[PDB]
């Protein structure tokens, strides 16, 4: 369906085997499926057709808000309240977007496990690696900021991480 993006939410092609009956006995599942189609599917399809006809007469649109980029807390001067405000709001929006990214990856993982069923350990290794990488990066970014997290605290954590990486590189080169 065009409701969502297939590239963002991938689904493997569906391979349904053709029925190969070996007995003359009638299939109760087939008979009940025919009954369900006759009694339920047709009336609900007619109702949805009427509703969609009524919708098409009043077609109106809504838009997605776009935020232009602004200088971040690194560029802001010390105790420059306006630049700090803009940078903090931008960091909070980025935090929300990153959280939704992790949510999308987790949904991929869950859906793939359920779809694979009994062979999930081998067939879901591709989605497990992506989740591992994304969770690792997200944890390193926002792991222990606290209840009163802020762009300044995230920047301080990044500075500490960069100093540690530089020290490790120097020690390895020594």
């Amino acid at each position: 369906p065009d409701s969502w993006d297939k590239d963002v939410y991938p689904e493997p092609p569906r391979r349904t085997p053709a029925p190969a009956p070996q007995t003359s006995l009638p299939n109760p599942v087939t008979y009940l499926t025919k009954i369900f189609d006759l009694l339920v599917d047709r009336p609900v399809t007619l109702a949805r057709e009427f509703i969609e006809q009524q919708h098409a007469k009043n077609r109106y649109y809504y838009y997605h808000r776009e935020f232009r980029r602004v200088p971040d807390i690194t560029e802001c001067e010390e105790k420059d309240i306006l630049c700090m405000f803009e940078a903090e709001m931008q960091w909070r929006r980025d935090y929300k977007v990153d959280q939704e990214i992790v949510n999308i990856i987790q949904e991929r993982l869950k859906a793939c496990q359920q779809r694979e069923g009994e062979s999930y350990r081998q067939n879901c290794a591709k989605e497990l690696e992506q989740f591992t990488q994304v969770s690792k990066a997200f944890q390193d970014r926002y792991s222990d900021l606290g209840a009163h997290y802020s762009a300044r605290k995230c920047l301080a954590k990044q500075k500490q991480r960069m100093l540690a990486e530089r020290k490790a590189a120097k020690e390895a080169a020594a």
């Binding site: 997605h64 690194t74 929006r93 977007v97 939704e100 990214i101 990488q133 970014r141 960069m162």
Partner: protein, 99 residues
């Protein structure tokens, strides 16, 4: 006795004078209208209208906005081979570490 004190009055029952009493007031008309306004305003107005107003409050928390932004970023990054989650929040070029 050490005082000229009134005897403790008997408990006053609203059902004795008014069998169909709502327990709001002694006067039957005032009691009935107090019940009517309390029930109408509280239940009808506050409960129903506030609940539906809260249910249909506009998405000012940007939940769906954030989901759409994340979908766009995931699509763009996995199309171009970039990591889905960036390793750093800020730019190390713009960060200047002490010597």
């Amino acid at each position: 006795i050490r005082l000229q004190e009134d005897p403790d009055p008997e408990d006053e029952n609203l059902y004795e004078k008014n069998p169909d009493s709502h327990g709001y007031d002694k006067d039957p008309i005032v009691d009935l209208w107090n019940m009517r306004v309390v029930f109408f305003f509280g239940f009808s107005i506050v409960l129903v209208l506030g609940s539906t107003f809260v249910a249909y409050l506009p998405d000012y928390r940007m939940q769906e906005w954030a989901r759409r932004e994340a979908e766009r970023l995931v699509k763009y990054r996995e199309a171009n081979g970039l990591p889905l989650m960036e390793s750093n929040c800020f730019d190390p070029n713009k960060i200047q570490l002490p010597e």
